């Protein structure tokens, strides 16, 4: 058991099939049999009742609190975690071959592996020459109109490829000690906005490695309803195989 599937939800079935089904279906075809889902409870903790009518192999649902972050909800189910965690979100609708990411976590003994896609507050992504090792993680909120790179980083890696328009899939392969540190330091609220930039910064100061797989085929429809139609426009395209 090198991975435990974990699903974040803090969702309404906007589509032909329920939105949560597609990540569940992807995990099922990729080989998973035990899945952990954290359901929203701000409005009503009835998502477990809704999913109790599904025909998936095995699901373990847990209601969340009134308000919690992604990292906080990860901390919520710590006793249920024993190995490296595959953290996903219900909004993921993609036909990715997960071995394109998991292998990055396998071959290099990565501390964290993530999935991102080419696009149609921007995020600055700095990778190496091979295009796999993530060197820089930035958002315009924390920058005073000046992007700063340490001299030692360029000493070790004298070529940095910068991507401005890229969409994260919120698909993460995380080591156990990452979750242990997450519980040790309660300051972190969301893995997407603080934990990953913190790990990328700690990559250059017991070795820490961050890897990212960049895709150019399909991505997940964002939380806003504006892209909700677009996923449907592709849903029938992807429903034939899946």
């Amino acid at each position: 058991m090198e991975f435990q599937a974990v699903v974040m939800a803090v969702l309404l079935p906007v589509g032909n099939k329920p939105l949560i089904w597609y990540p569940l279906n992807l995990l099922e075809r990729v080989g998973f049999e035990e899945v952990i889902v954290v359901t929203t409870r701000d409005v009503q903790k009835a998502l477990c009742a809704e999913f109790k009518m599904k025909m998936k192999p095995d699901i373990v649902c847990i209601p969340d609190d009134a308000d919690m972050g992604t990292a906080d909800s990860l901390r919520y189910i710590y006793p249920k975690l024993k190995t490296d965690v595959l953290v996903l979100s219900c909004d993921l609708i993609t036909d990715v071959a997960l071995h394109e990411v998991v292998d990055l976590f396998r071959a290099y003994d990565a501390s964290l592996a993530m999935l991102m896609r080419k696009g149609q507050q921007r995020d600055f992504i700095g990778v190496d020459s091979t295009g796999k090792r993530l060197l820089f993680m930035a958002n315009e909120a924390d920058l005073d109109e000046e992007l700063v790179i340490k001299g030692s980083i360029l000493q070790k890696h004298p070529r940095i490829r910068f991507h401005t328009g890229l969409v994260d899939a919120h698909l993460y392969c995380l080591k156990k000690y990452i979750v242990d540190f997450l519980m040790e330091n309660g300051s972190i609220t969301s893995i997407r906005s603080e934990l990953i930039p913190y790990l990328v910064r700690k990559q250059f100061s017991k070795s820490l490695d961050i890897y990212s797989f960049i895709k150019e085929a399909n991505t997940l429809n964002l939380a806003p309803y504006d892209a909700c139609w677009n996923a449907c426009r592709g849903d029938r395209w992807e429903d034939l195989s899946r």
């Binding site: 058991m1 090198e2 991975f3 990729v30 080989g31 998973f32 071959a97 997960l98 071995h99 998991v102 292998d103 396998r106 071959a107 290099y108 003994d109």
Partner: protein, 356 residues
Amino acid sequence: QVPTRKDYGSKVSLFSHLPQYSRQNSLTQFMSIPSSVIHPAMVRLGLQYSQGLVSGSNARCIALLRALQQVIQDYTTPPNEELSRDLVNKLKPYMSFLTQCRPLSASMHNAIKFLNKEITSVGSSKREEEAKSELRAAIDRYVQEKIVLAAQAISRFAYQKISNGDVILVYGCSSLVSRILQEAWTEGRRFRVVVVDSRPWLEGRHTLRSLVHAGVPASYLLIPAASYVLPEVSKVLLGAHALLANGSVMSRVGTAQLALVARAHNVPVLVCCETYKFCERVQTDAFVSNELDDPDDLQCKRGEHVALANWQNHASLRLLNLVYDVTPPELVDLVITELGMIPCSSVPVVLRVKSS
């Protein structure tokens, strides 16, 4: 179960009996995530084997033994069965998967034989956790004795064969050779080293860096120019991947070339090898048993174009990337092992005294 890896490209007719894979192609794309048929440690080990993340024979053996220790730690016995049989039967698919990822080296073969002998020797009355701890301790002791103490003894033996003001020629990358040279320089010997490298791996560069970091003067050149530099060379120190029962030295391709040119230039040839790399099999040439690497590695960018790009378009064109070669015992003057300084013909004798 585990699918069969597909052969890549067209092979030379003389080498049609050997597998030939593609580096980009991996076996894990058709395997379940998380891994169930194959233990995750073995999956990761095979992934780094096929991509060439670990390459040295000693490094490959150490990584294999670490993965095996992890498997033994995670292993549990099934009801109405014995560990001595269940573990042996369970390890075989993992080794088949590893072989599919990349053909096993001689050191890994010997390690597998030793571990199988150790597991078979485990008594039925032994407790599960006692047996697992004993197996892990045996693996650690095997690593210690067969690698670290052997390298230290070989370095001490080779110190006596290195004198002040001599020129030593080395080939490729070998941890034993680098350690020997580093300790020889440390104890006070003053000399210079000539490093020989070959395409496409260019492993010798590694050794060069080590020498540069040790303060030892060093020179660098490719294998075709070796005949130019041997007139000033006094001794040739070669690492070995395996020693065969007939005294032949199985090593990186180009080693027998250097031995032949050194003999043509009247330069003695010294081979250092740990006794755990000795093999009972025999081999007269490099055709019967060898490894076929990725042919696309032979492509080189000369000028502004790659001449070998899309080489599969030509039906009659073939690309051969041999990994190993065999040096006959008549081209080797001395073998340095942890047992001492012996002739090549004494290789079977060691095989007789190690077994019993």
